[PDB]
Amino acid sequence: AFDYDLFVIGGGSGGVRSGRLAAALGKKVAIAEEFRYGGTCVIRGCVPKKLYVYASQFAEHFEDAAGFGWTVGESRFDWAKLVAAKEQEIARLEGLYRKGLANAGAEILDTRAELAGPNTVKLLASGKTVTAERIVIAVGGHPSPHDALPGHELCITSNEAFDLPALPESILIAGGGYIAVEFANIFHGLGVKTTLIYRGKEILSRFDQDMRRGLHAAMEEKGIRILCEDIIQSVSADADGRRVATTMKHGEIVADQVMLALGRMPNTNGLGLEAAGVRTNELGAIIVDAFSRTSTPGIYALGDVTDRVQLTPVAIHEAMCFIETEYKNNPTSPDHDLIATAVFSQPEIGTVGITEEEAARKFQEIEVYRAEFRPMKATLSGRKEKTIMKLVVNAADRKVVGAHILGHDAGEMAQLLGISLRAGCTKDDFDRTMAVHPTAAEELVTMYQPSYRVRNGERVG
Amino acid sequence: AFDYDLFVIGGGSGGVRSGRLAAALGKKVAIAEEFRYGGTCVIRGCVPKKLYVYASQFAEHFEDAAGFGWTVGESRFDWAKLVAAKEQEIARLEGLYRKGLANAGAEILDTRAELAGPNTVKLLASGKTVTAERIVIAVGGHPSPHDALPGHELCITSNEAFDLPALPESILIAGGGYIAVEFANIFHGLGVKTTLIYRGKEILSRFDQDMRRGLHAAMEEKGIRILCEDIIQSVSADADGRRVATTMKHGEIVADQVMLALGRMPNTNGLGLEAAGVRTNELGAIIVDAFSRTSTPGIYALGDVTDRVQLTPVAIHEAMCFIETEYKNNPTSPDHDLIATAVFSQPEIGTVGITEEEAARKFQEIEVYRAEFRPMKATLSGRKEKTIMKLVVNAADRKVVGAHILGHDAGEMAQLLGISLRAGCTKDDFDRTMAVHPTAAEELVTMYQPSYRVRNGERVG
């Protein structure tokens, strides 16, 4: 017999659910975590991200207010007071996540943990060796290095973007991902002069053309300079502690901060992955099968470390299906079909299903239903914003193969359309659905005619 | 033949759809509105209502911003500015509907219309007499006058609510339905000392228990006095112009305005129905079959005048079904089950399907999935709010037969959930649906275990 039935590496979303449910079953479990319990999402991901999105939004609320008869007093924003607030809440969350593990009977450990033998775990903080039947590696990722670019040391990442000395007067953000455009709309909302720089032609490349192009237009219209098809050569400092970033095509740009949000990578360098026999791809990610099992027998991998789909509910699903398979005697493969997602840009993006371009490659007759309108609030607020609602439909079986929303509450809507596309509902099901008035979502249940068609890769209408 | 192919009496939602659609088929159409084109919804219903909701929501936005590092200086509300901002919009909408009709070719006239024969319509404003082949009575209702209550002429309806010459410092609202609760929330949000009184045991008596009790709780928690199982004996005016209302149970309450929000009634008096043999029920509504046919051959009735579900989309749908039935030789019926609805109280309600009480009776075995939680934002605002999210499921099917949401965006959610329920989604479709994080909506897709069961109408303890 070994020291533990289960040893979990990484106390993030996937690991905690793994370690906790297993303990809850009366298994002797141990979990290690080198930073703080709760992992990225809680500590420097979704939670603070969204809290800061809320903080940035209040500025728009104040202006909209005017249109409804409110005269609003002067408003001051204190960056420090937000970081203070955020800090307390993330301490709070971490507290409870730690307690869940202590309750379920699991033994909790503060250290970095590494693989030694085939089922042996090297513990750094105490320098001991432990053995386990199963080892779960829920280790996650970290912001990409870009060390080859001079001056990277001066730049920041999501890791410190939340905990800065001060709100900058101006910022440069690099990349076109969901993390990049989130922060741009966060800082802009908070009065920071915001600029966005990106390698690709259109931001958010893997999203639908209308989302990519619509978010662009609104961000520019609201005053975020976006330089597409461009790059930083170097970052250096002026005599002021400010940052000077050299571009290829848009000269040089002087900002308080430079933020690098070009991708993420898995925490695998020197984890012991050749030393345990754990096959890793060129991206650096852990290759696992339908049961989250690695090349080595007793070793499992789940979460961002596997570089499949890198979101929180995915780590959690895999943790659960792991426990079902390994303990509850009920084999189950985690599902990655039809995941709905959200981007907390202003305005929001909610998407589920496949893109127009992707649907156009996949099927031979596709129908596009597209709504674009001034939200009702805007009518009186005086804001220039438009909500775009796009449904992509396969003409053969009338299925909705993709749903894309740009506008208020789009994230919440994404979730619920998730269920509708999951159960393979038809454009007809939408049409038979009675409208709820007044809402935005009623635009999805009344577009009886297609905006246009696509046949053999060609738009027709 | 006749002057017109189709006369439409009433320029609200039902009538306008009807006229515009029919005219756009090259039919001689005529339409008469005795007041303002666009009808209740546009002028003094859904549209203006939702704006006032928005106006009222900013109050909470100001205090809520504090917990996010904002300090907002005191803000002041100007009623006269709201009401004005509102008129500018409804006037714009009114005009768009007028423009819409004209563009289709329909003849617009501003007059009340009554019925001569069964194919003949009189137009009071010109004192003329006109013939049509088909007639549509899309006349709608009006707020109930309570001529039995002493001093009723001192009270207000939703007609006057939007347009009070000044903002009351106190209001007392009799009524328990969605109109009552919306206004009470609107006025409260705007700083009116608000009191609500109702003759029944619980407000929104048609709604699920957790919708009723939950909203009640949040309302009185925030400073709204609710008085159940009680009635107004009489209203009278005091020396200062204020209103004194007499109660069976809570003595006499003085307020600036007393709103009666207990039911609407159909505009069927002296409409010339009797002369046209158009049968009417004891509540004064026109009796129709499922294809909007009155008891007189050439004549149809649709909208709030018809006894039915009194909502704008219902009117609209009825009107399309009419165009179809009478013109496209495609007989189909509007009558429909599973209409999702919202109540724009605060917190919002959103609801589809049937209540826990109904399902308990209708099915032998049900499963209930109940979620109660502090919205993410409240984590920092300190707001003291709870989201209730409740799913009702048939144990035999796994069918979701009811979904009920109390909290932010419950209306948008209801509409989307309504698609899922129309298409008969199972609790399993929900569970297979990957979560979107962080949202409110993900609580509907991860309650893998029921919160409780009901068998033979009684809960398992």
Ligand SMILES: Cc1cc2nc3c(=O)[nH]c(=O)nc-3n(C[C@H](O)[C@H](O)[C@H](O)COP(=O)(O)OP(=O)(O)OC[C@H]3O[C@@H](n4cnc5c(N)ncnc54)[C@H](O)[C@@H]3O)c2cc1C
């Ligand atoms: C800015 C930002 C915004 C995001 N927003 C969202 C969002 O809105 N929605 C969403 O679904 N997802 C979001 N994510 C992603 C989400 O955080 C992750 O996909 C999720 O946390 C993956 O969980 P995990 O448990 O696999 O990894 P993690 O949650 O990162 O857990 C790994 C933990 O293990 C620790 N660890 C690493 N190596 C070792 C070791 N050798 N020994 C001991 N401990 C170790 C690390 O310190 C880390 O805390 C966001 C991420 C970022 C960066």
Ligand SMILES: Cc1cc2nc3c(=O)[nH]c(=O)nc-3n(C[C@H](O)[C@H](O)[C@H](O)COP(=O)(O)OP(=O)(O)OC[C@H]3O[C@@H](n4cnc5c(N)ncnc54)[C@H](O)[C@@H]3O)c2cc1C
């Ligand atoms: C305060 C309030 C809030 C509401 N909120 C919502 C909501 O959020 N969502 C929702 O779906 N519904 C809502 N409704 C209900 C909605 O407004 C009605 O269901 C809808 O307007 C039905 O329209 P209709 O076709 O019956 O005619 P209406 O829209 O009532 O209009 C018919 C028109 O005919 C005119 N007319 C009447 N008699 C005659 C005559 N004898 N000759 C000529 N013209 C005449 C009337 O003046 C009226 O303009 C609300 C209603 C109220 C009162």
